[PDB]
Amino acid sequence: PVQLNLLYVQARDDILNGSHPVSFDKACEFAGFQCQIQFGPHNEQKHKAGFLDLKDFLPKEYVKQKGERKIFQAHKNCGQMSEIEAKVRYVKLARSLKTYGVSFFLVKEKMKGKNKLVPRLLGITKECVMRVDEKTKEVIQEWSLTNIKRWAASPKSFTLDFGDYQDGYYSVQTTEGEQIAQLIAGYIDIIL
């Protein structure tokens, strides 16, 4: 039980603070689990609009989304679920997500359609590099570390060369081009 509470607090905190990027729908699902755990089964007369301080149940980016309704719906579908069970379900859900355990970096993509830069989520794992929608948290494009020919890290950007995979590179604006590059180099070094 105690081990379960450590895993829970970690997964919850990583979601609430943004460390673990998730969609709006998923954020409300967790909230539901969080509510059950903190308040017990949903109660119409005790748990009514305004009861929840959205700041403690959703990631910053989702507070002003008026999703309290979605949360109470998630809380309601928990039925008479015990705290332990809800905790268990919280973690499993977090671990089942494509974004779980992925080191992310907030970068900016310069494309056509305009001259403005589109913020984007860049994730690095021990076996791949992924482009994630800054908002939807959906995976736009994913690359295999083995497809990387070379990379360039400047104090203002980072570039990836896949050589024989696709035409052109993939550059983004970031002040962590160094951090990202080192991360990749290390992972690649262990594969061989």
Partner: peptide, 11 residues
């Protein structure tokens, strides 16, 4: 002194 491993904490 002693430092406990989380792996042995109650479930």
């Amino acid at each position: 002194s002693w430092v406990y491993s989380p792996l042995h904490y109650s479930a």
